[PDB]
Design a protein around this motif. Sequence first.
Motif, PDB file in Angstrom:
ATOM      1  N   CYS A 203       0.835  -1.189   0.000  1.00  0.00           N
ATOM      2  CA  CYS A 203       0.000   0.000   0.000  1.00  0.00           C
ATOM      3  C   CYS A 203       0.873   1.243   0.000  1.00  0.00           C
ATOM      4  O   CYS A 203       2.100   1.163   0.000  1.00  0.00           O
TER       5      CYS A 203
ATOM      6  N   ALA B 250      -0.632   4.418   1.802  1.00  0.00           N
ATOM      7  CA  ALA B 250      -1.223   5.426   2.671  1.00  0.00           C
ATOM      8  C   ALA B 250      -1.184   4.988   4.126  1.00  0.00           C
ATOM      9  O   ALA B 250      -0.955   3.816   4.422  1.00  0.00           O
ATOM     10  N   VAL B 251      -1.360   5.947   5.028  1.00  0.00           N
ATOM     11  CA  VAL B 251      -1.544   5.683   6.450  1.00  0.00           C
ATOM     12  C   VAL B 251      -3.016   5.398   6.705  1.00  0.00           C
ATOM     13  O   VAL B 251      -3.845   5.541   5.803  1.00  0.00           O
TER      14      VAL B 251
ATOM     15  N   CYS C 252      -1.098  -1.969  10.362  1.00  0.00           N
ATOM     16  CA  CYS C 252      -1.301  -2.338   8.974  1.00  0.00           C
ATOM     17  C   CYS C 252       0.013  -2.740   8.347  1.00  0.00           C
ATOM     18  O   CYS C 252       0.954  -1.946   8.292  1.00  0.00           O
TER      19      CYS C 252
ATOM     20  N   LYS D 251       0.286  -3.165   5.291  1.00  0.00           N
ATOM     21  CA  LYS D 251       0.199  -2.546   3.972  1.00  0.00           C
ATOM     22  C   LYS D 251       0.355  -3.580   2.868  1.00  0.00           C
ATOM     23  O   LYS D 251       1.099  -3.394   1.911  1.00  0.00           O
TER      24      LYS D 251
ATOM     25  N   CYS E  19      -4.494  -6.650   4.332  1.00  0.00           N
ATOM     26  CA  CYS E  19      -5.547  -5.659   4.168  1.00  0.00           C
ATOM     27  C   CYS E  19      -6.919  -6.276   4.320  1.00  0.00           C
ATOM     28  O   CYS E  19      -7.675  -5.905   5.216  1.00  0.00           O
TER      29      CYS E  19
ATOM     30  N   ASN F  72     -11.443  -2.949   4.694  1.00  0.00           N
ATOM     31  CA  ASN F  72     -11.280  -1.938   3.663  1.00  0.00           C
ATOM     32  C   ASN F  72     -10.284  -2.358   2.595  1.00  0.00           C
ATOM     33  O   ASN F  72      -9.213  -1.761   2.474  1.00  0.00           O
TER      34      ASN F  72
ATOM     35  N   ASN G 137     -10.474   0.493  -0.668  1.00  0.00           N
ATOM     36  CA  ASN G 137      -9.630   1.683  -0.648  1.00  0.00           C
ATOM     37  C   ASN G 137      -8.166   1.307  -0.551  1.00  0.00           C
ATOM     38  O   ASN G 137      -7.512   1.626   0.431  1.00  0.00           O
ATOM     39  N   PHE G 138      -7.626   0.612  -1.544  1.00  0.00           N
ATOM     40  CA  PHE G 138      -6.327  -0.009  -1.336  1.00  0.00           C
ATOM     41  C   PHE G 138      -5.197   0.981  -1.552  1.00  0.00           C
ATOM     42  O   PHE G 138      -4.283   1.066  -0.729  1.00  0.00           O
TER      43      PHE G 138
END
Lengths: 292, 292, 292, 134, 134, 439, 439
Positions: free
Chosen positions: B147, B149-150, B247, B249, B254, B260, B263-264
């Motif tokens: 991934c 994002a945070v 996470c 990531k 995920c 979620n 929203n990867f």
Amino acid sequence: PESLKAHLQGGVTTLARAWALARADGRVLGFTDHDVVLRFDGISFEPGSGMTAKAVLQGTGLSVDNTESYGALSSEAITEADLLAGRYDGAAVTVWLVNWADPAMRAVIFRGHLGEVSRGAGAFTAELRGLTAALGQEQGRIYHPRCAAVLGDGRCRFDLTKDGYALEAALGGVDEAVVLRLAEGAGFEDRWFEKGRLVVLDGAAAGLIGVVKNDRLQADGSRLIELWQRLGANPVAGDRVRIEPGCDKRAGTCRLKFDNFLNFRGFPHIPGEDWMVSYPVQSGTNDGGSLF
Amino acid sequence: PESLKAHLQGGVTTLARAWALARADGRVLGFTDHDVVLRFDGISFEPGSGMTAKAVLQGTGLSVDNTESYGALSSEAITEADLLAGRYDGAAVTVWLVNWADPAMRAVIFRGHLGEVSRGAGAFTAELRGLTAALGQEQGRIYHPRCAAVLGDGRCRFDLTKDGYALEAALGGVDEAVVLRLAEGAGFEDRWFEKGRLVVLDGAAAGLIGVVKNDRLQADGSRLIELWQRLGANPVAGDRVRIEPGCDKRAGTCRLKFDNFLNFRGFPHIPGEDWMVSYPVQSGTNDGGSLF
Amino acid sequence: PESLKAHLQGGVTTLARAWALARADGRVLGFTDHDVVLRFDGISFEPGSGMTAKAVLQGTGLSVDNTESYGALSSEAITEADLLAGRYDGAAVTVWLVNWADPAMRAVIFRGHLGEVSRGAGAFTAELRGLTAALGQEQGRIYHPRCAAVLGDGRCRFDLTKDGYALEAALGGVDEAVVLRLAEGAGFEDRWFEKGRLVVLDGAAAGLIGVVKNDRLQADGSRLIELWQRLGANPVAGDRVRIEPGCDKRAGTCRLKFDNFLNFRGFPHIPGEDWMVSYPVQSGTNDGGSLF
Amino acid sequence: AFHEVRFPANLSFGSVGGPERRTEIVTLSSGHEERNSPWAHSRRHYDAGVGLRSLDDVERLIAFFEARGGQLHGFRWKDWAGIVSFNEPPPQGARVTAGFEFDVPVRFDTDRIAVSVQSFQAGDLPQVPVVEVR
Amino acid sequence: AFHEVRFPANLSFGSVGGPERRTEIVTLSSGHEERNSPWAHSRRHYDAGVGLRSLDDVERLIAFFEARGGQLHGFRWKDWAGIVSFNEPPPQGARVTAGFEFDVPVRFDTDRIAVSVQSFQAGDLPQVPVVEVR
Amino acid sequence: ATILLSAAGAAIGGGFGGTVLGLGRVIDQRLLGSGSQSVETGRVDRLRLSSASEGEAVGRLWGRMRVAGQVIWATRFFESASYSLSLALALCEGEILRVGRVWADGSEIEVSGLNMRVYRGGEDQLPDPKIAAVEGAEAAPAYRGIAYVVLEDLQLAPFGNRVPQFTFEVVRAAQGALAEAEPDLTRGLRAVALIPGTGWSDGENYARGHWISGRAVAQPLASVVAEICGAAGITEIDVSGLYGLVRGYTMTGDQTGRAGLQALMLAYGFEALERDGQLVFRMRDGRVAADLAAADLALGEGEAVVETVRAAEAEIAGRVRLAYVEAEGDFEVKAVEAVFPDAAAGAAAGSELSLALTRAQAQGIVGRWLAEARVARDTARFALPPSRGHLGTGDVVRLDLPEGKRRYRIDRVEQAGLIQVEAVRVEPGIYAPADEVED
Amino acid sequence: ATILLSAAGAAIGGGFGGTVLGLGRVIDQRLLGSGSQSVETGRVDRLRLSSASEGEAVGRLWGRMRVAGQVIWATRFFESASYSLSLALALCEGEILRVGRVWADGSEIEVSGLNMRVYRGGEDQLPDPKIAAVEGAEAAPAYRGIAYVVLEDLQLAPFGNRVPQFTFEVVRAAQGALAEAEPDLTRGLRAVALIPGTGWSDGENYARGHWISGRAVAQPLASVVAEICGAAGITEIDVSGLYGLVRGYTMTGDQTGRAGLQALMLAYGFEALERDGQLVFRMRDGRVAADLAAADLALGEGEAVVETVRAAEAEIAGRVRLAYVEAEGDFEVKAVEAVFPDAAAGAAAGSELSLALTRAQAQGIVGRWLAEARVARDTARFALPPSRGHLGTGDVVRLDLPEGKRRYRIDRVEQAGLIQVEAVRVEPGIYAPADEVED
Ligand code: SF4
Ligand code: SF4
Ligand code: SF4
């Protein structure tokens, strides 16, 4: 030194520095350390200005030599309204090392080109770039689809006076030295010269070159012309300018306005990157044509 | 200056410098040259610290402005146990130039960001980076197979409180501020949160963020957790921390642990260089599949 | 320091600096700050020269350490006719920090390599490059069509004394230390050794290496040989030189003159760029051959 | 560090010296400023000693610098100006004495000394600055 | 280096000079110090000699600098202040004498000298510093 | 108020930006010496390819050397039914001699198979080729300066069907005002004839034979360096002391002017001296002009008669390398190296020269650098009085010492009435033929 | 006469040229600290292609890693009638283990289909391959050091008819004098056997399984850094404190020596300390050796006991990136990143390491840098007395303060009899396994 070694090997020596710069205009200026005006050539070196002569450097490498040459600006001298307007740019110097007792005992330290001049506090300081200033610059053509040469150039000779092309008329209405009214606007096309040489040959700006833009005649052949940049010296609404015609540097504007389409020195077609990596598809137009 | 020109065009002027910095925490600090405590906003500028105000520089270029702003550190002031622990990092300042006779006659010289703070010899020296500090940095994603994002990010919204995900429990056994015992370990999986936010909201480290690693519960739900780095302020074995879940990531972590997977904001497949220059051999597997 | 901490933790200390450099020749030189000649190893450190010991620097990075080590040159010392000729180049030092009261209380600050020596005004200044000087240099072979090794090298072992290959004869007619007459020219081919080692093992230039060129015998086996460079010490027309044979570093000169064509360590064929992007045309020669 | 002797008895009128304080200071350009010191003591920093006697006293004085001196030894110093406290404020001095009775071990603040001859028997040296290293 | 003579006999009142040391020092800022000595000896470092006699003495003094001087020779120096020890401490001096009986071979610390005329026959020069190179 | 630590900032910009205004490189700097800063020079072009964009610059070359060219005015693909084009590849500027030995992508195509019309690119302004009557006469371009080569009815069949990268051997004679005076072969010959004839064969004496096939192309080094300063605009250029053959140098457009010249200063080693305003380019030799004794130097700044610096042993360039062009066969990038026998343990320092030269010459050059770069370790930094100011900036000083009598060529003369010199050690025997055998 | 504003010119050259003589990079400098200047390092090679020129350098590698090789001695195309060659591709130097898994341009070719003869490149000087008896024995090259792979009767039919770019998995054991002492697996094993057998399957415990397939190749980090200093010539090298597995590092020829080593100083983080002349390479830890109180520092130059610099928040490297090589599958360039949760708003700082390592290890390294580069913001600049000079240049100081007791590893020790230190903040917990799951 050139055969002043007999003078120089003695400890009793008297060599006073002195130099002449030749401006872009035909006049030269004289400068000396000797504190008395002296001359050997027809230059009349004046000790009223110039001449601190700080530390000429050298190098076997292509890098230039330098001398900052601190001095004074005055009405007889450079006077700095001359300097700011655009003169002394490619001014060529020779520094000399003359014997003031006998000015036939002299040589040249270097012949310079006076690159950077910093004036301030009622004085000027002018870096004398060396003989090799031109080396170190990029010169080339990049196959671009316009032309590449100026009008007077050898790669496109034109005979720029050959007909009623040049506008010789004397100037009126100088305003802020960008707008120029010009009493004799009439005689040419509207927007005839858009990239031309506004050589002004009289008065304050004597032999000073600007570039035209916005050649528009508003009423009864006024021909209000702008320039890109200020002349740097105000014309006095009585000077004589001549304006060579404007070249858009394009094949259509070349052959139509001017006859000289032969001497083009440009690259109109120049297919493109996408043509190069293209493989020939056997569909649609694949017969010989313009590719335009 | 903003309409103090009537005050300023007179040679009799009295403009005393003064500035406020807003820390990352909600409190601000006040500083002035005036030698008397003054305020115009609710800031209460103190001349007890700060304020040497050395030479703000400027530039039309994107390069930042700078001011080293020498001063003093004290118990009312920055106090440097606050500064070393990790506060004042993205501290935002405004420098002002107030009239001390009338503080309604003021302007802002610049609004800065206080990049480099060098403290020493009982004093501090803090370079005020300009408004354009963020420009000049690299921002981008590189199509990597994780991934990007945070958890709180807009590119992956999560509603991080939506169930029993966060561990709200108060802290015991702080040891060397990397190991944390935590009395209420029990309530979650073993190794549930491995990359989470250890926000500590009470006591010494108030609102200070660390990152967890080694979420292991040894006996009866102890949940001994390490951190990557020290908090910089010692928690007092009574503080309250909350730890958001971890996470990895990764697509497997995920969708399994979190719901979620939509929203990867990541790039799982990303074939490779050797695929790109490969020509298709007509041998073996050449039917449509995962390529994994 | 190595177990002089009992000596050193007391404020009453007496550690006087001292160092030894080992030249490329087998002799070492001694240097000390102590002002009295002292020794611990068989080096006999002399305070007559050397020893200003200015500011050894350090770094966890691969960059070298440095110490300029100002001193004096004298007849007992370096003497600078030794230094200029080509000695002290890869001179290895150890700096020590001995107790002059008891020289068994010492350590090494660093072991250096003495890169840059600047001598002048009756003194010398010699930058002590650190242990990591060799890192930071380019080492590699570039697949060039010659050989790549020297004669004595492990990649081409030769047994350089195996027959009448070396010319052991004593020297006469040294002239300007580039031309060498050599009384015993006769014994070998004309132009036998063109890239060889002129090791001179007696007299002034003791153990000094030059490279030969222009091996020509003019009359009755004179064998006048030039060199690329001066030896830097004048041979005295009585010295003994030995000259190893010359290798052109080429396959033809390898196998003909020398037997060792097996140990080639070179890349003779190396097809070329134009071969690589070439697609095979089905015309002309397309049978298996040398491609040469 | 020694416990060897006080000094030659003679000291001329002008033997100056008083406590020296680090006093690291910030000097805020606004106005008032803060400061702190890391000593909790004060180097007494005595200067301007002068030996003035016959030349018989000089050879025991030039090697006083040399023999037990060198640079780095004690030679306990006599002050013409076990814990002493100063009670004239409601604060306190409470400054220790490692040596007994004002003897303040020091060292000379000089790479060299400079003894002069002013007459057949007069021996003078203008200054020997100390700082009382602990 | 010579063994030529002591000096002209005359020396004015004020011929100063005393031993040196390098003894570099760190002054640990929060407590006491620690300091090193690399010498085990001392440069005696005599200064401020003055010749004062007639002009007959001057020409044997200006060429004293020149003839046996040059720059780099001995001219053993007489002290108005074979191994000498100093026993007035329980430490020791134990400083060697390469020359006999306080003769301390030196060299002048000058690129030039400066002799003055004070009256029809007065010859003066204000200083000739020395450092006693080994 | 006080100033910050942009006192370091104002020390750089423009505190040091004023300097370089008025002013692999691993071996480039040592060969020029203290000298001046060696500008980045001649990353040699391998896999010469032709890019048909609008941002590539006009190349320039002097002598027999392959150049890529680029596409200008290609017509559409024409299917005979299996393709056909009408290219025009523009090689280089100036009047050239004829283009022979065309080879496309891959090995070789016979020029008799082509329908190419070469053009000199004459300032005489050659008319339209009439193959551009596809476009018509009214828009036919008529290139004045550049030397384009059109291609007519080119079958794209043998090389795929895509356009192949064409590369062209070009022979260009050195031009410029100094070149038309003093004519060398390329027009100086004025009829040689005497074809030996008298018919695998006896070419072992070609390198020593009187006949001039092949090497008649190569321009003297005097006029090529005159062409550079002529194009840069220095007509005051003095070049009578140069003695070299160029044989196919090639620098591109926007190659700084001097950086194209600086590759020649590594090969032939010449001074670029500039005693007076003539900018004398003399070939570097060991011919001593000064003969200073140690007693005859002036009092310098550092108050040392001669400060002598010997460079580090860890950086002596133990082995040197080139990247020359083959210049006899198929023009390809090659490399030779010279290895010093005692210290071969490291310090590889190579550079790339884009000119074309033969096989024994390249090992001669690298044999010259490895000797010179170890000779030029020693530099001297002394000051000599203006009583003898006729030591020009590129002369060489004997410099008698009590110990040595080592020569020194000088650089960086800064006088102001006290000529202060950064010399460098130069021996005479470095500048000789190496006399090596050939390939 | 006076001097000009080349006082700025003589301040640079060689006023600052003497410095770097005696001395993406966005994250390379922070990890080495104040330290020294991080040399440009490891632009990772993607699309490994083989260039048959003469100017490419001899590569070197340590362990299982693909290398391009290049063509040496290719015969002419041979038409069977549809082509055939006799290549020889030279991979790398030194004695190697065998070359398996050859894949050309594109996916994969089976080595059983080829007629390749691999060679170790032994210093024993392997004879001629006898496929070079095309050339004949009298001119057959017999390469000593380099490890070439010939190819025999290679049909150019499946990949076009042009030559395809071949790429070769190579296994090379670390050599050098420190490597032959203390033998690791690659000769230390001296017969393992015990093939588990007992036959999609159960590889979930391969990362924890006792069997040594695949990872038997990977050389210990101790001997590879010993091989670098051995090739550079430093035999005084001390490396007993190193504990790492290399698994296929690869630097090319003319990679400066140290710049190849400097990529390892980012991965395993080790000191390159040099206390004494041994040049001790110890692995970096937080093991405190000093324990200074605040009362025990010396008086510095700037007259501050401890100057403490905290770096800018706008440059903290909020997210860090790598460019490692896949090392398990088909060796391809990959990338992982570590993102700090509070400040993800910017400061991307990535670098490229040319070595090969697995998937959980790469996220472990970037997880280590993002922690360290934010820890190494704080630097200290103090001076400590020579009473304790045994603080070597790479040790770490506890440094008790009234407020904090924060550790500091030290750099740039400049003593002259007063050890003055530029430290940097280092915590112990940074140097741990991250313990992450795998791919
Ligand atoms: S349009 Fe014609 S005259 Fe004008 S610049 Fe172009 S070629 Fe020259
Ligand atoms: S795993 Fe899901 S929640 Fe976690 S960072 Fe990736 S996208 Fe966001
Ligand atoms: S020719 Fe033979 S002996 Fe000479 S360098 Fe080459 S391989 Fe070595």
